[PDB]
Write a protein that binds this ligand. Structure first.
Ligand SMILES: Cc1cn([C@H]2CCCN([C@@H](CC(C)C)c3ccc(C(=O)O)c(Oc4cccc(Cl)c4)c3F)C2)c(=O)[nH]c1=O
Ligand SMILES: Cc1cn([C@H]2CCCN([C@@H](CC(C)C)c3ccc(C(=O)O)c(Oc4cccc(Cl)c4)c3F)C2)c(=O)[nH]c1=O
Lengths: 195, 198
């Protein structure tokens, strides 16, 4: 079994990368693709509260992302890992650290303590960080507003901080998407072939 | 002026909602309600080709929906917007993305390329998505369905979910699982808030 998370800002090619890597890994592994809340009923109800939120307090929002994360982990991820699956998970603890911790300004250490309560030591085996520059990410976002640009920059600064302070494998996401996919696939295969 | 589209699967109460919201808005705004082809002659003739189709190729069907869309946009929508009107439109690009792109399986990116050729930058100012769960929607549709109809209905909803996830800024999702009086009220309030923001 392997619990592989994928992290990055928007415009990092993360959607293309996880989907193409899934289509390649499925030939050899029992693999699933998921994202929180991932169809888990309690998580889905929590997601409704977050998305129906009118100017929700940022700490309440962080605690709801954390509760959705625990439900998804306990009812979807852990059962799949027990079946020996390779779990490809789009966003996990590091998204809360970059978005709630850094970009929203709650503080990375405070959001870490919250998320460590939520995951109770179940950190990923491998975390792919799609390392995109703010400028390349901006162009992909436009294809797919000073405040929006500044928020995108802060998310990237937050990710740069989290990795500055073992499971992380940084992939150059400024390359064309074909190369980002190949490098991510090779990084995952190298890990899985080591058990 | 404002160009407002309404989207949703069948069973979302979309017909009832737009007609009721339109009736209330008419008292206060220079507003019109339309849908494609909406009486535009070329659009009506294209509509006949689509509805008389005998197992029509899904790509041909998409191009005809896009051709009706442009004729309606050029002849009805754009002149009304130039006259300063609020235009309420029942189904637009996102219907093609969810139905032809996702549910019929041509591909959302391919159908978006087709429809961007048709609308030539005229995306809605606001799109109201009547967000119904597959289960409530099914129950409204019955107010049983075969396995092919349920699966198609579920794919349309999945498609809309994916389209709204990748382009949130334009969309305002209204909970359509609520009784229709509340869906009407939430939609009306969302629109008033937007129009007063102009
Ligand atoms: C996992 C994680 C993500 N993110 C960000 C990532 C960028 C997208 N962003 C929002 C944007 C919208 C509010 C405009 C966003 C976008 C889409 C959705 C949806 O599922 O449709 C969504 O809902 C969710 C998602 C996950 C859990 C719950 Cl409970 C609700 C959502 F929150 C959430 C954090 O900030 N922290 C985190 O831990
Ligand atoms: C705008 C749009 C809608 N839809 C769907 C939505 C659900 C209804 N659905 C059909 C069902 C019938 C075949 C049983 C359906 C139902 C009624 C009619 C009519 O006008 O009476 C109809 O004709 C049209 C409608 C619009 C343009 C043209 Cl050209 C022909 C029609 F197609 C069409 C797409 O799929 N893509 C799109 O872009």
């Amino acid at each position: 079994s392997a619990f592989i998370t994928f992290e990055g800002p928007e415009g990092s090619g993360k959607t293309t990368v996880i989907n193409e890597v899934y289509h390649r890994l499925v030939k050899d592994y029992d693999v699933i693709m998921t994202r929180e809340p991932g169809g888990v009923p309690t998580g889905e109800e929590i997601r409704k509260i977050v998305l129906e939120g009118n100017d929700m307090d940022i700490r309440t929002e962080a605690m709801l992302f954390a509760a959705s994360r625990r439900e998804h982990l306990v009812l979807k991820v852990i059962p799949a890992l027990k079946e020996g699956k390779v779990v490809l998970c789009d966003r996990y603890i590091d998204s809360s650290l970059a978005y709630q911790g850094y970009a929203r300004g709650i503080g990375v250490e405070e959001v870490r303590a919250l998320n460590e309560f939520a995951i109770n030591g179940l950190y990923p085996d491998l975390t792919i960080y799609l390392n995109v520059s703010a400028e390349v990410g901006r162009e992909r976002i436009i294809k797919n507003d000073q405040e929006d640009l500044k928020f995108h920059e802060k998310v990237i600064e937050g990710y740069q901080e989290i990795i500055h302070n073992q499971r992380f494998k940084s992939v150059n996401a400024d390359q064309p998407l074909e190369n980002v996919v190949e490098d991510t696939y090779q990084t995952i295969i190298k890990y899985l072939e080591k058990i």
